[PDB]
Design a protein around this ligand. Structure first.
Ligand SMILES: OC[C@H]1O[C@@](CO)(O[C@H]2O[C@H](CO)[C@@H](O)[C@H](O)[C@H]2O)[C@@H](O)[C@@H]1O
Ligand SMILES: [Mg+2]
Lengths: 416, 554
């Protein structure tokens, strides 16, 4: 008896028509079982070929979780779906969530299945389950309720959400709550033990509406107050070589695209002759200060760089070797909003893909907390290699946009 | 009494009407044999006649069935297919016998008149109209409309293919002891029951289909092995592809090579060691389908080596989930690779090849990585799991490569197999400048208009060179400059260039290139004992870079 909220696609855009990609045995079984139970419970319903739309579907296991979780790649549908900020169902972003000592991430996607989906919009949620060795043609379904991973689910459902959290918010006015896709971000300044208790309070509070009307019991801890940035650094050497100064000049020349005040004249003077790379040349009086004055400029912040909510976020990542990984986040090139470095992640020293996947998840998490947006990634990897292994290591309930690049490292710019 | 198959609702594309095409000119022999076919379709209930209130019609013709006296009826629904809604095809791939598990009892039977046993949507039948000349367009002929899925309509495949699945759904669920592979109207049925109970279930299935109106003629009913299925011959303990006929013509046209290369691709799935490089090179260019190509000495040696393989009959085995999957790869030169997938030694589930030459510069490691990724995806499709890999590359070689390469890369669980030619890296650039090695500052420059250029270097020891160049580019000169420094240096050398382009190529450690200039640099790099490349920004007044830029520019 719940009236449906109407939905439309962006004017002049068809629905998603994406092929399903091959799935492993273990993953097909999980989906077949999961989709048999959703069909019974009326959350999905079988369809035929007359529905021309399709979306990919696979299964994942969140960190330290043993049971499967259906994951739909609604990236295409989300881009073709109406922007709900214009509908005023857009969720505002709190600027104080990134300041808290602790932040837990709760998967509330299971709640979206309680709300029906506009009949005229259900055909855009079509997906197909494949079979090993193509024993059976595709088994196609479509959603009758708000699907997990669709950008319209949290929007339509927010009105019901604020109700459930009204008593908890009034009892705990210092806690900050933020909703992004199937996730709920809860943060406070309490001690660890006191924090984790207030989360279990929020959980049972959700059961009190679950009894009233993947699973809710899981939670992941963040500590945004401990996040640091990776700035550009110039090495501190007591003796320099021709090679050291040649790399330094190139780096300073590249850096000047970001910091306008950088100068290399007095340093270039040291490279006047035609010398061997290994020759040690001292630093002139003018050069020492030029280096020191450039170091100073790299301490202070870039001018005129700030966040624009109307602009997409881009993120670049560089493989530095030895399990080190650097990244930068920006909206306009050379106006970086944040830079960082990751190291010793899972896969270190044996699996590049596992490390890069973990890095994409790490970076997206930080963009959600800080700005409420997922960035499009420029991944340093060959397309076919990424599309062969990335699903074997994905542990998040969302999927960001990405593109592939090949930029050899001529300047070790973000690492030494 | 047949049970009715629920129609699939179908539409045209928005703002589009039905098809209106006049009949094509039709020869007497074709005009006459067809009118015989139409009346029979009206009998069995496949077609209705009334037309005057129906403005639509689609062309029709007829070609002789393959070396048969019979005349086949086809409708050119290409105009209707444009105006018909898009479908989502549910056929995502083809089954492969290597993915089949051995069974004690087997059957293969087809559905008679697949498309014409399923009803078309009531409202869409009007658009399937068509017109046939009476007697050479002398009189006003007979009109008709389809009442079932017609041949040539883009919706007929997907629709029947899905309807067939709904009919089977109850049977599979109430007989989990059975395995049914369904590909269009073809049904493979296996189980470990006693053949009596198998023939029983097959009759229960045989009647269950007839209940929805799907016949299963005994002509298409295979009872005794070998079973013909999906182009293979299924014996109890081994499967094999049906015979392969390679053209033996002495004068080769383009299309003959295309046909030749096509069969070797199909052949590569079971016959190990197939190559198609030199035969495909013959087709590179705008050569028409009729041009006679003389086979090069390399293409004649390859076509001969392929026939040597196909002389002996090869068979593959079936899948045993209790066992691991092993995939072994071998290099065959000229960017070609072959692999075998098996669980027991010398008993291949299947084989294949990978000859893709992607990019202007490459090395064997990259290609090996691409063959692993192709084999992996193929293995997930057929068996749902990744195999263990046996590669002709040493752990030390691979460790050096991926740890130093700047893009992410990886290979799953794998072990080394000493089966030459092994994959190796032919040179390794130094990470730090070389003490005591001469330092070459190189640069190049070409005139965008005249295409004349210069390349050269200056060194810390006072060594210099400059060479004039004709019909060149800034990119080539910047490479020629590096090449000069490599030729004119000792076994150990430092090199400094401002060419982002030349450095991006070399640092990837290519062993082969479509540019001979690059190949020459590679040949040099393999001879050196220590090389250190370095990059500097151009026109910043640095070191010998400033000096050599004047030599080649002015
Ligand atoms: O990853 C690119 C590859 O994936 C496909 C199909 O999954 O498209 C996906 O990747 C895009 C980049 O993030 C998404 O924007 C797109 O919506 C998503 O389906 C293919 O189109 C492409 O080959
Ligand atoms: Mg220059």
């Amino acid at each position: 008896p719940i009236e449906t909220v109407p939905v439309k696609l962006k004017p002049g855009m068809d629905g998603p028509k994406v092929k399903q990609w091959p799935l492993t045995e273990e993953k097909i079984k999980a989906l077949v079982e999961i989709c048999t139970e959703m069909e019974k419970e009326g959350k999905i319903s079988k369809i035929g070929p007359e529905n021309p739309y399709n979306t990919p579907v696979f299964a994942i296991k969140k960190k330290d979780s043993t049971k499967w979780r259906k994951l739909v790649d609604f990236r295409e549908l989300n881009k073709r779906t109406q922007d709900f900020w214009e509908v005023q169902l857009g969720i505002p972003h709190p600027a104080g969530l990134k300041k808290k000592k602790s932040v837990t991430v709760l998967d509330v996607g299971d709640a979206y299945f309680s709300v029906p989906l506009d009949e005229d919009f259900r055909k855009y949620t079509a997906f197909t389950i494949p079979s090993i060795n193509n024993e059976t043609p595709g088994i196609r379904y479509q959603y009758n309720v708000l699907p997990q991973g669709w950008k319209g689910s949290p929007a339509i459902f927010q009105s019901s959400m604020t109700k459930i959290l009204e008593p908890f918010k009034k009892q705990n006015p210092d806690i900050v709550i933020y909703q992004y896709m199937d996730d709920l971000y809860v943060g406070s300044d309490l001690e660890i033990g006191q924090h984790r208790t207030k989360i279990e309070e929020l959980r049972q509070h959700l059961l009190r509406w679950g009894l009233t009307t993947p699973f809710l019991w899981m939670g992941y801890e963040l500590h945004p107050d401990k996040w640091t940035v990776q700035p550009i650094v110039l090495p501190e050497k007591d003796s320099w070589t021709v090679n050291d100064i040649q790399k330094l000049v190139g780096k300073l020349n590249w850096a000047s695209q970001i910091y306008p005040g950088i100068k290399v004249r007095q340093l270039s003077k040291l490279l006047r002759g035609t010398k061997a790379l290994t020759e040690v040349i001292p630093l002139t009086e003018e050069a020492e200060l030029e280096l020191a004055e450039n170091r100073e400029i790299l301490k202070e912040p870039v001018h005129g760089v700030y966040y624009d909510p109307s602009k997409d976020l881009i993120a670049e990542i560089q493989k530095q070797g030895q399990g080190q990984w650097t990244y930068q986040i920006y909206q306009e090139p050379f106006k970086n909003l944040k830079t960082g470095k990751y190291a010793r992640m899972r896969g270190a020293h044996t699996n590049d893909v596992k490390q890069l996947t973990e890095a994409v998840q790490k970076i997206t998490t930080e963009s959600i907390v800080i700005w409420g947006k997922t960035p499009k990634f420029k991944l340093p990897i060959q397309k076919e290699t990424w599309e062969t292994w990335w699903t074997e290591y994905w542990q998040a309930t969302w999927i960001p946009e990405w593109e592939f690049v090949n930029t050899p490292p001529l300047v070790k710019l973000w690492y030494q | 009494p047949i049970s009715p198959i629920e129609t699939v609702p179908v539409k045209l594309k928005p703002g589009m009407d039905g098809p209106k095409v006049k009949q094509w000119p039709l020869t007497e022999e074709k005009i006459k044999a067809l009118v015989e076919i139409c009346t029979e379709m009206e009998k069995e209930g496949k077609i209705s006649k009334i037309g005057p209130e129906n403005p639509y019609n689609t062309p029709v013709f007829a070609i002789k069935k393959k070396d048969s006296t019979k005349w086949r009826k086809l409708v050119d629904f290409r105009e209707l297919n444009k105006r018909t809604q898009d479908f989502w095809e549910v056929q995502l791939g083809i089954p492969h016998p290597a993915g089949l598990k051995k069974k004690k009892s087997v059957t293969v039977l087809d559905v008679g008149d697949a498309y014409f046993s399923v009803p078309l949507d009531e409202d869409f039948r009007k658009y399937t109209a068509f017109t046939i000349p009476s007697i050479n367009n002398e009189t006003p002929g007979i009109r008709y409309q389809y009442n079932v899925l017609p041949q040539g309509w883009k919706g007929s495949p997907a629709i029947f293919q899905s309807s067939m699945t709904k009919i089977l759904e109850p049977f599979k669920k109430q007989n989990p002891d059975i395995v049914i592979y369904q590909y269009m109207d073809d049904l493979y049925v296996g189980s470990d029951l006693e053949i009596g109970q198998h023939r029983t279930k097959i009759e229960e299935l045989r009647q269950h289909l007839l209940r929805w109106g799907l016949t299963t003629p005994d002509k298409k009913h295979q009872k005794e092995p070998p079973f013909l299925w999906m182009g293979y011959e299924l014996h109890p303990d081994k499967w094999t592809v049906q015979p392969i006929v390679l053209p033996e013509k002495d004068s080769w046209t383009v299309n003959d090579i295309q046909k030749l290369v096509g069969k070797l691709n199909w052949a590569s799935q079971i016959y190990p060691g197939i190559k198609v490089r030199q035969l495909s090179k013959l087709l590179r260019g705008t050569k028409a389908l009729t041009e006679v190509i003389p086979l090069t000495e390399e293409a004649e040696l390859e076509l001969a080596e392929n026939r040597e393989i196909l002389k002996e009959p090869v068979h593959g085995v079936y899948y045993d989930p209790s066992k691991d999957l092993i995939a072994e790869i071998q290099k065959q030169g000229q960017g070609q690779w072959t692999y075998q997938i098996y669980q027991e030694p010398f008993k291949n589930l299947k084989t294949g090849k990978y000859a893709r030459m992607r990019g202007a510069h490459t090395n064997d490691v990259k290609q090996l990585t691409e063959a692993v990724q192709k084999i992996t995806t193929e293995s997930i499709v057929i068996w749902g799991k990744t195999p263990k890999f046996k590669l002709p590359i040493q752990k030390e070689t691979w460790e050096t490569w991926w740890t130093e390469y700047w893009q992410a890369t990886w290979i799953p669980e794998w072990e080394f197999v000493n089966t030459p030619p092994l994959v190796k890296l032919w040179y390794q650039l130094e990470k730090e400048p070389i003490v005591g090695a001469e330092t070459f500052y190189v640069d190049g420059a070409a005139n965008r208009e005249t295409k004349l250029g210069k390349a050269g270097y200056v060194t810390n020891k006072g060594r210099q060179k400059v060479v004039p160049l004709t019909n060149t580019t800034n990119q080539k000169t910047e490479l020629q400059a590096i090449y000069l420094a490599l030729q004119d240096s000792g076994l150990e050398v430092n090199i400094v260039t401002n060419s982002q382009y030349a450095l991006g190529i070399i640092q990837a450690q290519p062993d082969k290139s479509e540019s001979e200039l690059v190949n020459q640099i590679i040949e040099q790099l393999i001879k050196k004992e220590k090389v250190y490349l370095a990059w500097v920004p151009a026109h910043k007044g640095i070191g010998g870079n400033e000096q050599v830029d004047k030599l080649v520019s002015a």
